């Protein structure tokens, strides 16, 4: 945002005094703007909203539709789960719930786990979901044809380092640099 500094500088035409630009403005006229209804092609349901546009671009298209990209999701209903997307600890219900939720939260694993329903299904950590998603993607790749454990070691190493009591933090960090 800012750090409490001078105000922004904005474009202006009527610097000087509209005696300079009297001619440059009088000789031209504006393109007629209109409040026009539009429907974004990115909308699965064809709802319509208003906004200001030039009345020569009316109803053309919504430039932000190109931001509507989505990441893929695997598919299985009756037999692909048993044949290819096999599992022995996760039910079809839990896998489908996790997959729909991952689409909800666009494979943002942390908030995915945050939502992961702990009372419709048994508890588990983020890296379990991450590695299971990797496994399902690998299986899909095979039919359609770095290490989670070290990440757990990560979480525990950071937890130990930070939970370290302040005096030990200072002493060890001294010991850290001395050698």
């Amino acid at each position: 945002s800012d750090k409490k500094d001078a105000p922004p500088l904005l474009p202006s035409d009527t610097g000087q005094g509209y005696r300079t630009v009297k001619a440059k403005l009088g000789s031209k006229k504006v393109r007629p703007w209109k409040w026009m209804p539009f429907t974004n092609p990115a909308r699965k349901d064809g709802a319509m909203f208003f906004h200001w546009r030039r009345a020569a671009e009316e109803g053309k298209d919504y430039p932000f539709a190109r931001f509507n990209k989505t990441v893929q999701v695997p598919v299985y209903s009756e037999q692909e789960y048993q044949l290819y997307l096999h599992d022995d600890a996760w039910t079809k219900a839990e896998t489908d719930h996790l997959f729909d939720l991952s689409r909800r939260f666009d494979l943002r694993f942390v908030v995915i786990h945050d939502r992961y329903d702990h009372q419709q299904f048994k508890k588990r950590s983020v890296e379990d979901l991450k590695e299971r998603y990797y496994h399902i993607c690998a299986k899909l790749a095979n039919v359609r044809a770095f290490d989670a454990g070290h990440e757990r070691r990560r979480k525990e190493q950071l937890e130990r380092l930070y939970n370290r009591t302040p005096e030990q933090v200072a002493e060890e960090e001294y010991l850290l640099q001395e050698l």
Binding site: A6, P7, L9, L10, P11, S12, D13, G15
Partner: protein
């Protein structure tokens, strides 16, 4: 009397000068620049270099 008037005028001039300088500083306080020109806005105008 002329010496007294000259000294009093010197002090009055000094005070008026200090007051004018204070007013000039107060003027400087406000952000002197708020906008710029259009040909100096959409034509890249400069390179960090």
């Amino acid at each position: 009397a002329v010496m007294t008037a000259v000294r009093a005028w010197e002090f009055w001039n000094l005070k008026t000068l200090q007051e004018r300088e204070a007013r000039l500083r107060l003027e400087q306080e406000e952000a002197e620049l708020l906008t710029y020109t259009r040909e100096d806005a959409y034509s890249m105008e400069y390179v960090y270099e």
